[PDB]
Design a protein around this ligand. Structure first.
Ligand code: SAH
Length: 196
């Protein structure tokens, strides 16, 4: 929960011109900190090859590198987001790679997946391609989703059908912001582990 990490993550540049249909909002520092600290504390970051699905501006990627990831592979469909991503990860040059294309087209096996995927509120089931890919390329997955009864039921069922079990689920409220009001939603930060 390191508030220092959250603070440092909040200093990164955001999206130039957010495409709402792609749910482009930078992962809030607090939620990002929670997910990363949890993964770090369980030994799922340091020295690991990490894939950041829907990397966007690179908040999760930066935090992972900051916490000792051996390397991070940033998967993002929008080039304009990658421009910001590259600048944000400037101090970790050579330690990250970028895959510009749809998440479903990426297929490199990694040690860990971390992601703040679209919840699927702008486009039906937009989050499924991310969960499917994450389950496909890794044995440990960290993701964020809407803390709603229907969503929770689905996530639990979907991961199971794909051979994964939820080992941790942390619930927090995030605020998605010239200068005005926040959209305050409650999300669950999940940690999935491949059965046996
Ligand atoms: N089909 C798809 N394939 C790959 N990336 C996608 C996608 N649909 C949406 N995205 C990307 O998913 C990202 C997640 S939203 C927030 C990312 C956040 N800035 C962070 O630092 O983690 C968006 O930036 C968006 O462009």
């Amino acid at each position: 929960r390191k508030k220092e990490l959250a603070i440092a993550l909040s200093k990164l540049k955001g999206f130039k011109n957010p495409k709402v249909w792609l749910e482009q909002y930078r992962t809030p520092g607090n939620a990002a900190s929670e997910l990363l600290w949890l993964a770090y504390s369980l030994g799922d970051i340091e020295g690991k090859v990490v894939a950041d699905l829907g990397a966007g501006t690179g908040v999760l990627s930066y935090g992972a590198l900051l916490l000792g990831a051996k390397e991070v592979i940033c998967v993002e469909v929008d080039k304009e987001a990658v421009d910001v991503l590259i600048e944000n990860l400037g101090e970790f040059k050579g330690k990250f790679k970028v895959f510009i294309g749809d998440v479903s087209e990426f297929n490199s096996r990694v040690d860990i997946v971390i992601m703040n995927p679209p919840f699927g509120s702008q486009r039906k089931h937009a989050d499924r391609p991310f969960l499917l890919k994450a389950f496909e390329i890794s044995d440990v997955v960290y993701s964020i989703h809407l803390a709603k009864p229907e969503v929770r039921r689905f996530i639990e069922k979907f991961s199971w059908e794909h051979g994964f079990v939820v080992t941790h689920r942390l619930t927090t409220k995030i605020e998605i912001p010239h200068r005005k009001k926040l959209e305050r939603i409650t999300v669950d930060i999940y940690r999935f582990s491949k059965v046996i």
